[PDB]
Swiss-Prot record:
It comes from Rotavirus A (strain RVA/Human/Japan/K8/1977/G1P3A[9]) (RV-A). This is Outer capsid protein VP8*. Transmembrane segments: none annotated. Forms the head of the spikes and mediates the recognition of specific host cell surface glycans. It is the viral hemagglutinin and an important target of neutralizing antibodies. In sialic acid-dependent strains, VP8* binds to host cell sialic acid, most probably a ganglioside, providing the initial contact. In some other strains, VP8* mediates the attachment to histo-blood group antigens (HBGAs) for viral entry. It is found in: Virion. Residues 2-161 are annotated as: Spike head.
Length: 161
């Protein structure tokens, strides 16, 4: 079930809900943290982007990041992670898709996202201890999908809404 859409915002997301984010333009898509040892950032890159540095607002300040997208047809979401409050975001995972949809979810002890190349992208996860101060921000409209209906989230990620 597609709950939404919702306008951009920041909150402590309840566990077991995919945030399916649907941006229209390249740029920062989302960020999230448990405030202790994980800071996540997702950016969207348009097709045919040669190695370059782009500036994004992350964790409250401007940050320069290396990006590229070798595809002529798919857009590319890139997940960056830093593991300390004053560390350095580094590229961790990518999703290549012509549909410009990405998703993430919090569960007990994990954060999930989709990775690979549509239409055969699949879920990946990272050990993350959730807390009462955890928070996530979406810069684009998004939907919520219950974890019980993960198959439908996968359907949308790979094949479009």
């Amino acid at each position: 079930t597609l709950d939404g859409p919702y306008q951009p915002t920041s909150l402590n997301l309840p566990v077991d809900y995919w945030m399916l984010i649907a941006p229209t333009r390249e740029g920062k898509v989302a960020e999230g943290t448990n405030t202790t040892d994980r800071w996540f950032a997702c950016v969207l890159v348009e097709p045919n982007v040669q190695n370059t540095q782009r500036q994004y607002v992350l964790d409250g300040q401007n940050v320069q990041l290396h990006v590229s997208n070798d595809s002529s047809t798919s857009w590319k979401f890139i997940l960056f992670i830093k593991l300390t409050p004053d560390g350095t975001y580094t590229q961790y995972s990518t999703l290549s898709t012509p549909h410009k949809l990405c998703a993430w979810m919090k569960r007990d002890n994990r954060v999930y996202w989709y990775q690979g190349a549509t239409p055969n992208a699949s879920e990946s996860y990272y050990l993350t201890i959730n807390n009462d101060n955890s928070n996530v921000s979406s810069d684009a409209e998004f939907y919520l999908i219950p974890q019980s209906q993960t198959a439908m989230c996968t359907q949308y990620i790979n094949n479009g809404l």
